[PDB]
Every structure is written in C-alpha cells, then in structure tokens.
C-alpha cells in the first residue's frame, strides 16, 4: 500500500483528475497548474519512480476532447503536457509523441532526462514511419531534433545524440553542435558504426564523420576517412586546405602508404618532396634504414629455413627453392643464390622454372628502380631467352609498390609486350601490371589495350593481359579500361573460354570494380550477353570484386546461396563464391570472425569444388595474421586426401603466417614437409608455405588493411585476389605452367615497423608501450587503447592487430594513428 505521503498524493492527484469533470472556470487553470508542478517535480528528480505517473492512471478522453473545446489556447495546451508526460510511462507512442507535437511547447529540458530520451525515440520512430509522402509532419519533428540533440551533447549522451541523428537518416547538425571536447567521442563513434551501416547511409556517415573532423582542424583524421570513402576530391581539398606544410607532409605519407597518387600542382611547396614522398622513393632508404637498426641486413638461404638437419635436384623443388629465395630474402637488397651464380641456378629449371627464378630476381630487390634494375643485368637476355618473361616480371615487380618519374616499367616492357614469342609477352604484361598496379595511367592502360585485341596472343597471354589491365585500374572502374575489359570480355568465344586461363578474364573485370557496389549493377548487366557457364561465373566473380570489404550481409547471403547449391559449368561459379564471402566479410572483425564458422560448415557439409576454395578463403580473412584457430583449421585439412585441398590448405597457412615468423606455424610447416616428402606437388607448396611465412624475415605484411586496420589498400586487394582465384585451379595454374602467378602478391607487400625518428628524421628511440589494440569506442575519458603492454625501444615491429603509442608525452604526433612513418612534433606543452 502507501503512506501518509503516498496515499495523500494519490488523493491529491485523484482530486485534481476528478475536478476536471465539469467546465468550472477555477478547475482548468487551477488543476492543470497543479499537475504541472507535481509531475514536473517528481519527473525532474532522481530516477525515482515518478509517483505522479504511478498514482495518475487516468484516462485522457475527457480532457483530450475538451482540450479542443476548453480554451483551444493556453488552457488547451496545458492539458497536453500533463497527458504527454503520462504517455511516456504508458504505451501510447503515436499519441505520446503527437502531444508534445501539438501541445504546449515550453522546453524539453524542463521535463527530465528520461522524458527527453523517450521523445527522442518516438521522434525517430515517427520520422522513420514518415516517408517522403509529406514533409508537413517533418518540419515539426525536425524542429524537435533541433533542440533535443543539443540536450544530449552536453549530458554525456553523444551515443544517443549520434544515435538520434542516424535514426532520422540526416546527421548534418552534429557539425554545428560538436564541442572541442566532443569531436573525439562523436568522430570515433561514426567511424566504428560506419562499417556496419548499409548502403547508402554508410557512405553518408563517412563523409559526415569526415566533415566533423573538418570543423575542428583535425586534418590527419580527415585523411583516413577520405580514403575510406575512396573519394579523391575530398582528399584533394584537405591536400589543398592544409596550409601547414608539416600536416601536408604527413597526409602525403598516409596518401602514399595507401598507394594513392594525386598529381601535385607546382603551386604546392616542396612538390618534389611531396612527389617523392607520394612516389614512395623515400621508402627504400627507410627500409634499408630499418634493417640496419634491426640487424637483419644479412640475407638468408633456403637450407636454413627448411632446417634439413632436424627432419628424420628436381626442377620443381628448385622452383620452391627459387621462390623461398624470393619472399624470404625479398626486399632485403641481397640474396646469396640468385645474385652470384644465377645462370647456374636457373639452368636447372626447365622453361617455366626459369620464368619463376628470373622473376624472383626483381622481388628479391623491391623498391629500388636502380639497385634492382642494376641487379637486373645478368639474365633476362638468356640463351634461353624464354626467361625474358622472368626478368620482365622482375622488371615490372621492382616498380610495383612505387612510382618513378622516369616511368621505367613502360619503357623496357613496351618493346617486348609485342614480342611474338608467347612466353616473352607473359612477363611483359604481368610485370607491367605489378609495376603500375592502381596507377590507372592512361598511357599504360592504352598500350595494354592492343594486347587484348592482339589475336596472335595466346590465351595465357590474354588471361594475364586482362589481369594486368585490372591491376592497373583497380578500384577506379576506369571507363576506358572497363570498356576495354568490358568490350574485350564480350568478344570471347565459347570454346576458348573452357580453358582454365579464361578463368582470369572475368577477374580483370572485377579488379576494375573493387569497392563500388553501386556501379556494378550495370557491369553485371553487360556481362549477361555472353553465354554460360562463364556468363554466370564472371557474374559471380564480378559480383565479388564489386563488394570488396563492403561488409554487405546481403551480398554474402547472395554469395552463400551459390556455395550452398549442389550441382561442372555451375563448379567454377561456386569456387569463386566461397572466396566471395571471404573478401566481402573481411572488413569488420565481428563479421570476419563469423565467416570462419561459415567456412567451417562449408567444409564438413561441402563438396569437392567448395572444399578446395575454403582453404583459400581463410587465407584472405587473416592474411599475415596467425590466429591460432584459423591456422589450426588449415592444418586439420593440411593432410586431406584431395590433392587440391592439401595444396590450398598449405598455401593458406603460408598466407596466414606471412611475415609473422610464427614459430608454431614453422614447426607445423616443418612436420608437414616430412609427412608429404613423397609427393612433389605437396612438398613444393608446403616448402612454399614456409617461404611465405618468412616474407622479408617477417618484416613485411600482405594485409590489405592499414590505419588500425581501417584504411583499405585497394591495390593490395587486387593482388591477393589474383593469386587466390588463380589458386581456384592450382593444378592447371599453380601446378601447371604458371608458377609466376605467385608474384601477384607483391602489389600488397608492405612493411610493418615502429622506427621512431626525431623531428629531423634521425631515429628518435622513444619508449613506446606497444601491445594488443583495444577499442576506445564507448569508453568514457582517456581509455587505454593498448593492452599487454611491452615497452619497446623504437624502431619496433607490430604483428598484425597491434598498435603503438608514444609512451613519452614529450612529443605530439601529427597523425593520431601511429602506423607507418609518423612525424613526431615535439610537444610545446611538455616541460622538463
């Protein structure tokens, strides 16, 4: 029951509700004033159950009707406030919202935080239920979001504040209400919510959250988002708006790390430095610089990696020998086998063996158009000039991941892209694609145009050719290149398609359409002309390339259906389908970790063609990421009976452990070698897996994600896709004549380091507490984003999923996210 206070309050409210029975003059103004006080007093209190609302369980029918008759002026409105507040406790939303809509205005703050939020929900609920059929109701609701949103901004309720605007579909106002003490909370939230949000709201959020970064002059943060939307114009403005050269310098280093090039006008000061920084010429000096501090300049040899001592010269295994002396010593600037006696080494490889070995010569020395190009002066012109493709890939590979003002790739390669010999051309187009991947340069794209139409070119020349064009125009949907690809793809004949290398033609179509699912509706329309199977296959694969990293559950559901189907011309469509889920889902950690379960189900409940793709699919999900659960999953299928699954699982292990130097993966890899010693095909690739797991002695990562895993690297996602899909048929492609395709990864090959330099670029060894990154979203205050701290004296290495923070407040980094090369600005606030 109640007490003297409670029972009396029940009567006092009871008298007030009852007295409104008649139309007495001193019953409407007097009573409604009392309800206004008591209801306001309790509701604007601690979370105490609003005694007025608990006692007041009356019906508004009498007052709602007389509301109209009883003084439609102020006396009418007053009743609305009392009934409206009583509505929030009950379930009368439509009426509960529309009372504050029509009733007395006053102000939202006067009622109570609990009331304000409830109106927030209903306002969002009504706005969503209100379509474009009429804005007449929108102006009032829009007016409400004008006042309430400022209410949340102050009250630590930015989450509801951002949540409130997102519900309305319109989030402009945050620009005008965010305080210097709030942009971090709001800007972080949108970046975290943007990935999950579907099209097109997700795109709108990125720009808006990007905009908020603008209003408070946090320029480097605007950079990360600008690329996330993958729109160059907003990048160019920030490039232009950055009146501070230092911020200009840094935002170029993030522009470069993404592989994004914007033609810099000479009006911009330090154009060469910005051009050289953007061209990534300074990368080589650091990489060698990084090595000297780390003491890893000495090159390695295959025998030590394999550890032949512990285990209880065919041309193939020589290739695996040749490859491991690639990746493992790649980018170190010196190899002990491919630089001194190479003519001797290659001569024990028959044709395609020569191709692979020669190409590794360029990958052994990346990012040196001079040193590598000078380490490119003893083979290519071989008595078996067939290996010319080998150095041509090395020629193209060296230019991959960098841009030189002298355009070496086109010069050397062009004279041989028309070379009649089929093998000579394979290196030309492929190597060229690596060098200018994502460049989208019209010249090289144009020069690659005749390659498509050159009928004399063999299909293997063609398949690489379309792939080469795709890798250049990755993520730009280049109308000319797409047209060339789109025009070229249609002209293909049915009989010539049935070959495996025709599997590469659609790949080039997508690689042009990576990251833009809006424009791929048309591209899938044009492809419908060609007849199946490759019509359906290209449709799926083109479909996947459209949604690279979108996080679109819809496409994944669409993609999962294709894999789910149980049918040979249908299995190519399936295999690209499973790899489809891997690419689409690999943006967010929440979804990506879930795709593992789906991948696992596709293996126990899968079929021949699917079971081969799953081992590859896991490869893209966790590239350079030795998650134990995934690495274990590849192993338990690393011995499988089907040769294709055994190979793909072994390759996946190599990718997952790429550059991680994971001891367990190595020990796991070594044991497999002993198990599969008999079969050269397994032993070759298990040996290869050990090769990928030591990429750059671990000083590189093929992960396509930078910027706290947020900023996607378009050119990268092109590479992994080529090898992975090309691995969809390993025996014809991998085990066949196309050992060179493994060089497709070189596009995404990037360094992972923590070298800290002083403001003058001298290495400034700063205590950097580096550990597993922990999200700061939704954590009030200054949450620690690093856990499992292990103070390292920079330079340092960050295994994937790690973040480094400057443990000394002596400096204030220009860019908030400490990845790659960061300009540490000495803190003016710090006092010794």
């Amino acid at each position: 029951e109640l007490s003297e206070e409670d029972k009396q309050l029940q009567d006092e409210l009871e008298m007030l509700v009852e007295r409104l029975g008649e139309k007495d003059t001193s019953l409407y103004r007097p009573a409604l004033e009392e309800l206004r006080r008591q209801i306001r007093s309790s509701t604007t209190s601690m979370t105490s159950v609003p005694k007025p609302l608990k006692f007041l369980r009356p019906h508004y029918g009498k007052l709602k009707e007389i509301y109209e008759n009883m003084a439609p002026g102020e006396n009418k409105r007053f009743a609305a406030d009392i009934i409206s507040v009583l509505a929030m406790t009950m379930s009368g939303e439509r009426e509960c919202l529309k009372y504050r809509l029509v009733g007395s205005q006053e102000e939202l703050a006067s009622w109570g935080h609990e009331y304000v939020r409830h109106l927030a929900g209903e306002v969002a609920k009504e706005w969503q239920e209100l379509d474009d059929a009429e804005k007449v109701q929108r102006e009032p609701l829009l007016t409400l979001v004008k006042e309430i949103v400022p209410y949340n901004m102050a009250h630590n309720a930015e989450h509801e504040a951002c949540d409130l605007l997102m519900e309305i579909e319109q989030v402009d106002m945050l620009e005008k209400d965010i305080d210097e003490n709030a942009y971090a909370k709001v800007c972080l939230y949108l970046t975290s919510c943007v990935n999950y949000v579907p099209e097109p709201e997700n795109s709108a959020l990125l720009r808006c959250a990007l905009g908020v970064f603008r209003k408070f002059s946090r320029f480097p943060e605007a950079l990360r988002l600008a690329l996330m939307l993958n729109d160059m114009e907003l990048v160019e403005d920030i490039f232009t708006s950055c009146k501070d050269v230092v911020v200009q310098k840094q935002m170029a280093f993030m522009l470069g790390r993404h592989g994004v090039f914007l033609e810099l006008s000479e009006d911009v000061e330090e154009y060469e430095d910005l051009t050289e920084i953007m061209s990534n010429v300074q990368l080589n000096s650091n990489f060698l610089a990084l090595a000297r501090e780390l003491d890893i300049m000495e090159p390695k040899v295959p025998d030590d990696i394999y550890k032949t001592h512990l285990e209880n010269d065919s041309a193939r295994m020589n290739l695996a020998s040749s490859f491991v002396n690639g990746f493992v010593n790649a980018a170190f600037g010196q190899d002990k086998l491919l630089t001194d006696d190479g003519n001797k080494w290659l001569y024990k490889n028959k044709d395609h063996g020569m191709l692979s070995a020669a190409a590794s010569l360029g990958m052994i020395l990346l990012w040196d158009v001079d040193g590598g190009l000078t380490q490119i002066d003893k083979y290519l012109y071989s008595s078996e000039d067939y290996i010319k493709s080998g150095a041509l890939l090395a020629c193209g590979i060296v230019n991959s991941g960098v841009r030189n003002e002298c355009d070496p790739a086109l010069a050397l390669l062009s004279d041989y892209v028309l070379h009649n010999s089929n093998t000579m051309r394979l290196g030309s187009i492929f190597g060229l694609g690596l060098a200018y991947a994502g460049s989208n340069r019209e010249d090289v794209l144009t020069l690659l145009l005749p390659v498509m139409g050159d009928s004399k070119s063999s299909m293997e020349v063609a398949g690489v050719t379309a792939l080469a064009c795709g890798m250049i125009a990755v993520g730009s949907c280049n109308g000319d290149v797409t047209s060339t690809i789109l025009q070229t793809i249609m002209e293909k004949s049915e009989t010539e398609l049935k070959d495996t290398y025709a599997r590469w033609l659609p790949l080039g179509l997508g690689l042009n359409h990576l990251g833009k699912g809006e424009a791929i509706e048309a591209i899938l329309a044009a492809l419908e002309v060609v007849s199946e199977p490759f019509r359906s296959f290209a449709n799926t694969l083109v479909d996947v390339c459209a949604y690279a990293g979108s996080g679109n559950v819809l496409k994944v559901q669409q993609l999962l259906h294709i894999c789910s189907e149980h049918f040979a011309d249908m299995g190519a469509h399936q295999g690209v389908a499973v790899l489809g889920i891997a690419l689409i889902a690999m943006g967010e950690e929440i979804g990506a970790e879930m795709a593992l379960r789906t991948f696992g189900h596709l293996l126990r409940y899968g079929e021949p063609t699917l079971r081969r793709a799953v081992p590859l699919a896991l490869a893209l999900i966790s590239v350079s990421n030795p998650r134990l659960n995934i690495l274990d999953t590849l192993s338990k299928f690393s011995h499988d009976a089907d040769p294709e699954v055994s190979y793909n699982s072994i390759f996946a292990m190599g990718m997952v452990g790429s550059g991680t130097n994971n001891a367990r993966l190595a020990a796991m890899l070594r044991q497999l070698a002993q198990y599969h010693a008999k079969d050269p095909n397994n032993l070759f690739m298990v040996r290869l897996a050990q090769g990928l797991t030591h990429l750059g002695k671990g000083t590189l990562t093929l992960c396509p994600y930078h910027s706290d895993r947020q900023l996607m690297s378009q050119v990268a996602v092109a590479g992994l896709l080529t090898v992975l899909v090309s691995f969809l048929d390993v025996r014809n492609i991998i085990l066949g004549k196309s050992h060179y395709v493994l060089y497709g990864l070189v596009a995404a090959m990037q360094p992972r380091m923590l070298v800290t330099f002083d403001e003058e670029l001298r290495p400034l060894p700063v205590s950097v507490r580096v550990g597993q990154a922990v999200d700061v979203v939704g954590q009030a205050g200054k949450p620690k984003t690093i856990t499992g701290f292990q103070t390292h004296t920079t330079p340092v290495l960050l295994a994937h999923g790690e973040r480094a923070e400057l443990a000394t407040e002596e400096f204030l980094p220009v860019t908030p996210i400490l990845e790659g090369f960061v300009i540490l600005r000495k803190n003016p606030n710090y006092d010794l």
């Binding site: 989450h159 509801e160 951002c162 949540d163 997102m166 939230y189 975290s192 919510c193 999950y196 949000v197 996080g551 559950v553 994944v556 559901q557 999962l560 259906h561 894999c563 789910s564 189907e565 149980h566 889902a585 967010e588 950690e589 929440i590 979804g591 970790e593 879930m594 795709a595 379960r597 789906t598 189900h601 596709l602 409940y605 134990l628 659960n629 274990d632 192993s635 338990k636 130097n661 001891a663 367990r664 020990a667 922990v774 999200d775 979203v777 939704g778 856990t787």
Partner: protein
C-alpha cells in the same frame, strides 16, 4: 591427435552502454548466424550406397562393444564380451586389421560374435562431459589487478602455445 577442440565463442559486442553500436554489432553476429543456419538447413534440403549397404547387412543391428584381448591369427581375435567373458570371434574383412589393437573397444556382431568394427572415441560419459564446449564469457579484462598473478598464469598456459620460439630458443620447458 584430433587437434584442439577449442570452445565455441561467438565474437564479443562492445560497446556495453546499450548504444546503437551495440545493436548493430549484435545484428551482424545474428545476420551471419541467420545466414549460417540457412546453409545448414538449405544444405539438407537442396541436397537430394551399394557398397556400405552390404556391410551394414553383415553387421546387423545391434552391435556389441567388448574389449579386444588378442589377435590370434590375421582373421581371428579373442574379444571379451561386455560382461567379462571371453570369445574367439572371427575378424571379418571390412574391419581394419590395423586399428585393431589389444585394449581397443571392438564392435561385435550380435548373433555370431565376430569383430565387425573398432570403436575409437569411447571416452567415458564421465570424462566427455569434463570438456568445456561453450567457452566462459569472462575475458582477461574482466579480472582487475592480478597483473603479477595473471602474467604467471599466462606464461604457462597461453604464451607457451602462441610464441613457442621464445622458450625452445632459450632452453626452458614451458612451465606446466
């Protein structure tokens, strides 16, 4: 070595403030889960014999489980019935004369006791419930303090599985 049958933990949704970031992340987990159910169910439905069917006819139903004790000949072994008796049953062809090991739990024909199948994974129900399937939900960030105690318990049960190189590169055997 069946491999680690690790627990099955759904990813974690944080923020916890009950904000829309929370709803979206739970939805994403649900979306894939709804998708994952779709594949399991749509794999049995979309999914629409003369060698095994002959085998199952020789075995019949049911099939006893006693303990092998001696492989007398290649085609004869002595199997102890589930009561502690003995039997000089015959080893049929379909059985693998490799997995047949003294002490193994053998599947026996019911009418004419004859080794018909080797029942690996016969671990007691009393120890097969001892295995944790659904991983508990308290992450190292739910335990406050105990940084000196946690590290001591993370250098014997977690690190020795992730970075084995450190220990074997130094001569220790990971504390166990």
């Amino acid at each position: 070595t069946k491999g680690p049958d690790a627990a099955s933990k759904l990813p974690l949704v944080t923020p916890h403030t009950q904000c829309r970031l929370k709803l979206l992340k739970l939805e994403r987990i649900k979306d894939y889960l709804l998708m994952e159910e779709e594949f399991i169910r749509n794999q049995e439905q979309m999914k629409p014999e003369e060698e095994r069917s002959k085998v199952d006819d020789l075995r019949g139903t049911p099939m006893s489980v006693g303990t092998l004790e001696e492989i007398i000949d290649d085609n004869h072994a002595i199997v102890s019935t589930s009561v502690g008796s003995e039997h000089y049953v015959s080893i049929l062809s379909f059985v693998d004369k490799d997995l047949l090991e003294p002490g193994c739990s053998v599947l026996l024909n019911h009418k004419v006791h004859a080794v018909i199948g080797v029942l690996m994974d016969d671990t007691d129900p009393l120890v097969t419930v001892m295995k944790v399937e659904k991983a508990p939900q308290e992450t190292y960030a739910d335990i406050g303090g105990l940084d000196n105690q946690i590290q001591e318990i993370k250098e014997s049960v977690e690190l020795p599985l992730t970075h084995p190189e450190y220990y074997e590169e130094m001569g220790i055997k990971p504390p166990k």
